[PDB]
Amino acid sequence: DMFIIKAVLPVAESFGFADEIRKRTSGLASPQLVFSHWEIIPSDPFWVPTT
RNA sequence: UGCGUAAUAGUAGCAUGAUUUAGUACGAGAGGAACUGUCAUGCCGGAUCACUGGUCUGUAGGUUUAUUUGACAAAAUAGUG
Numbered sequence: 001d002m003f004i005i006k007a008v009l010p011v012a013e014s015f016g017f018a019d020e021i022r023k024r025t026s027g028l029a030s031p032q033l034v035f036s037h038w039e040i041i042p043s044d045p046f047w048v049p050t051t
Numbered sequence: 052u053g054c055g056u057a058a059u060a061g062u063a064g065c066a067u068g069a070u071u072u073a074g075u076a077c078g079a080g081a082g083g084a085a086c087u088g089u090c091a092u093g094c095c096g097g098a099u100c101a102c103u104g105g106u107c108u109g110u111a112g113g114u115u116u117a118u119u120u121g122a123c124a125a126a127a128u129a130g131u132g
Binding site for chain 1: 079080
């Protein structure tokens with residue numbers, strides 16, 4: 001009876017994210033959290049913007 | 052003289068809470084209203100003294116200090132002792 005998305009979701013930006021949607025809507029939003037591996041994105045974190 | 056009018060002017064009541072609605076509506080939950088009804092309350096005003104309190108030259112009674120009038124008596128003065 002279920003419909004599935006396999007969309008990626010950063011570990012940091014979920015901080016009680018799966019807990020909210022589950023309670024708000026049980027059955028019509030049942031997030032099963034399963035790790036895979038760390039995706040690399042084009043961005044360079046560094047302290048102080050120079051020039 | 053009475054009984055009246057009423058131009059002109061002034062003019063007064065305002066504000067809350069509890070409950071009823073309703074743990075309702077609303078909201079995934081967290082929470083959480085209103086119209087309406089009732090009982091009250093804050094300040095504002097206009098009166099009144101039945102109660103309660105206040106006051107006392109009612110110099111109304113009661114008590115007592117000092118002095119005076121021989122004593123008791125019953126009074127006086129002490130600016131209402």
